[PDB]
Design a protein around this nucleic acid. Structure first.
Ligand SMILES: [Mg+2]
Ligand SMILES: [Mg+2]
Ligand SMILES: [Mg+2]
Ligand SMILES: [Mg+2]
Ligand SMILES: [Mg+2]
Ligand SMILES: [Mg+2]
Ligand SMILES: [Mg+2]
Ligand SMILES: [Mg+2]
Ligand SMILES: [Mg+2]
Ligand SMILES: [Mg+2]
Ligand SMILES: [Zn+2]
Lengths: 107, 63, 170, 50, 190
RNA sequence: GGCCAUGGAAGUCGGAAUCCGCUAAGGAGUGUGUAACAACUCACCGGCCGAAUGAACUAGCCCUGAAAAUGGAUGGCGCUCA
């Protein structure tokens, strides 16, 4: 098994706080350095969460979780392509304010 | 040894390193290279102080 | 050209044991003289019995149940090479259990130089499910609506000379 | 030679593997020698550099 | 293993009309026509539609199966030769002696004339293949552009030019002089 | 720009080390490049296509291993789904 441990582990914290936090939204990124991310995290120690991982697996583990929190019932056909995960519990105005920036964009 | 209480200051001193979720991870990181050469690090070599601290030895919640 | 035989034998009865257990083997042999010989060859590989201390009780041909139904057979083998002794498993398409075994002997003769004397047939099984087929070279003939031509036909002539140009259409 | 052109030249003259038995000049990623005289050996080693 | 049947699918773009009869492929496109005889291979062709062609090998062994996708790739190269063209760019590599390259015409034939290669008094001449266009790049210093519809002729002429500029009796790791293919693309950029 | 060596070595000259933290991802680093950085490339994790894939081993025919002297012998011709 080996990886399946870390596999189901990625499916552990995958939820837990899921119900705790409020309805999140899109989190798209591309060509993002590791330092970039790392710093964004600091800006969110308790402000939010910085979850990341693959695309298909992320579905599967939760794609069937339509038994514990069915709620979604369809809140899944949205992870398309390069997709991360940033949690939160506040308001929309206090969202992009505590991310964005940290830009290295260029030609 | 030289763990003392003043190494927890090097944490807040170099509190610009490992963003480690909790500040104690600064110490953890600080210690993480403390074995680089290996010295009198708590009268021993790291990976036995550090690793154990993460495993849960005493307790240093440090605010 | 082979047939499948059911050979049944037993140890000779003694005053201690007057009805020894009857043992049957399925033997693929060209005739009944070799069928009873192969039986004793394999019993002495397993049991404390001899032809001198034993008795052949019955020899019967086992005919194919549906000789005009196309089947796929799996054959488990144990053969001796020039260097060692090996177990193998192979698959064949044929309509009779005997005709698959005839192909097997030709097949291990051709690809491994394994003579008849070097081969033990462990088991011949007809594969009921299409998922039971493990080998590619026979699974490719289990596809739906299988069609293929036969290009480059060579015609055998009764005469030495033909006055018209040869052709290979077909 | 400018470094851009020296890498282009090195792609054809230097970035190679060598057969240990017959000295054939092989692609760096080759697993066997292409020559029949050595038996398509896997005993290769990178072409040495200055 | 004698695979029962193996298939490859050619794709014909909109302006291209492939035309196959007795293993002689004639591909027609906006840029022209190219033909190739494949009588040394046993393959069969089926026209799926005006934009697709099935290429089949029946009951072929491992090597004869290996010869099928190469047919696919050659015909695809023909298609892109008559719809996009081919372009190889060569850079002139020398440490000390500049290479004097001219496009000459002798005996009614076009030639590539290499002079002063590594200081040699020898004048190297490479015949320019039919259907192959040479040009001295104006936008780049020490660049040769080899272009044409046929990939085989263009790459082989380029190889002729590269091979005639080989270094003898020296350490070629140190004496890196020569003419090398630097860019392999198409006339129509994508 | 880890420690020590070092004129300099900052991962990519050389020695004790092979850790920590964020991580899903990253080695105190697999290379090209520098006096040295930088720089790019990898290790691993990502997006993408979507059905198969990798490793070790066994034995058949073929190839290499396989160099001697007049020209020359599966008996000869010749033979390649033989
Ligand atoms: Mg995933
Ligand atoms: Mg067979
Ligand atoms: Mg005629
Ligand atoms: Mg070596
Ligand atoms: Mg030499
Ligand atoms: Mg010399
Ligand atoms: Mg064998
Ligand atoms: Mg000899
Ligand atoms: Mg002689
Ligand atoms: Mg002979
Ligand atoms: Zn070799």
């Amino acid at each position: 098994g080996g990886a399946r441990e870390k596999k189901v582990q990625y499916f552990s914290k995958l939820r837990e706080l899921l119900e705790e936090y409020k309805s999140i939204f899109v989190v798209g990124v591309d060509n993002v350095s590791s330092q970039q991310m790392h710093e964004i995290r600091k800006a969110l120690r308790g402000d939010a969460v910085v979850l990341m991982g693959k695309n298909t697996m992320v579905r599967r583990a939760i794609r069937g979780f339509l038994s514990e929190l069915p709620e979604f019932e369809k809140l899944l056909p949205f992870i398309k392509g390069n997709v991360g995960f940033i949690f939160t519990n506040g308001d929309l105005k206090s969202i992009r304010d505590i991310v964005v920036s940290n830009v290295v964009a260029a030609p | 040894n030289i763990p003392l209480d003043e190494i927890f200051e090097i944490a807040r001193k170099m509190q610009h390193k490992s963003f480690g979720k909790n500040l104690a991870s600064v110490s953890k990181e600080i210690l993480g290279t403390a074995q680089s050469v290996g010295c009198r690090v708590d009268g021993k070599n790291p990976h036995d102080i550090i690793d154990a601290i993460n495993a849960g030895e005493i307790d240093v919640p440090e605010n | 050209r082979l047939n499948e035989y059911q050979v049944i034998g037993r140890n000779l009865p003694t005053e201690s044991v007057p009805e020894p257990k009857l043992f049957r083997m399925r033997i693929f042999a060209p005739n009944t003289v070799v069928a009873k010989s192969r039986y004793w060859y394999f019993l002495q590989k397993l049991h404390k019995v001899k032809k001198a201390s034993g008795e052949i009780v019955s020899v019967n041909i086992i005919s194919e149940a549906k000789p005009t139904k196309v089947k796929t057979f799996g054959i488990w083998l144990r053969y001796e090479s020039r260097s060692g002794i090996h177990n193998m498993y192979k698959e064949y398409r044929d309509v009779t259990r005997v005709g698959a075994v005839e192909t097997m002997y030709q097949d291990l003769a051709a690809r491994h130089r394994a003579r008849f004397r070097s081969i033990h047939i462990l088991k011949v099984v007809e594969l009921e499910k299409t998922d039971d087929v493990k080998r590619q070279y026979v699974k490719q003939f289990l596809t739906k609506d299988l069609k293929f031509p036969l290009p480059h036909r060579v015609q055998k002539s009764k005469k030495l000379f033909q006055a018209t140009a040869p052709t290979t259409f077909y | 030679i400018e470094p851009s052109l020296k890498a282009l030249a090195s792609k054809y003259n230097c970035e190679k593997s060598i057969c240990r038995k017959c000295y054939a000049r092989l692609p760096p990623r080759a697993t066997n020698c292409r020559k029949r005289k050595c038996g398509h050996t896997n005993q290769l080693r990178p072409k040495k550099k200055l | 293993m004698k695979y029962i049947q193996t298939d490859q699918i050619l794709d014909i773009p909109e302006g291209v009309t492939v035309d196959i009869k007795a293993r002689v492929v004639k591909v027609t496109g906006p840029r022209g026509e190219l033909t190739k005889d494949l009588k040394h291979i046993d393959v069969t062709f089926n026209k799926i539609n005006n934009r697709a062609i099935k290429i089949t090998v029946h009951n072929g062994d491992r090597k004869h199966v290996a010869a099928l996708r190469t047919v696919k790739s050659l015909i695809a190269n023909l298609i892109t030769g008559v719809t996009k063209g081919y372009k190889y760019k060569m850079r002139f590599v020398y440490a000390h002696f500049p290479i004097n390259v001219n496009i000459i015409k002798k005996d009614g034939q076009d030639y590539v004339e290499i002079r002063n290669f590594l200081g040699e008094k020898r004048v190297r001449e490479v015949k320019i293949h039919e259907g192959v266009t040479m040009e001295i790049s104006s936008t780049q210093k020490d660049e040769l552009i080899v272009s044409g519809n046929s990939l085989e002729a263009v790459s082989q002429n380029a190889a002729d030019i590269q091979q005639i500029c080989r270094v003898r009796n020296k350490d070629i790791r140190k004496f890196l002089d020569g003419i090398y293919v630097s860019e392999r693309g198409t006339i129509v950029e994508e």
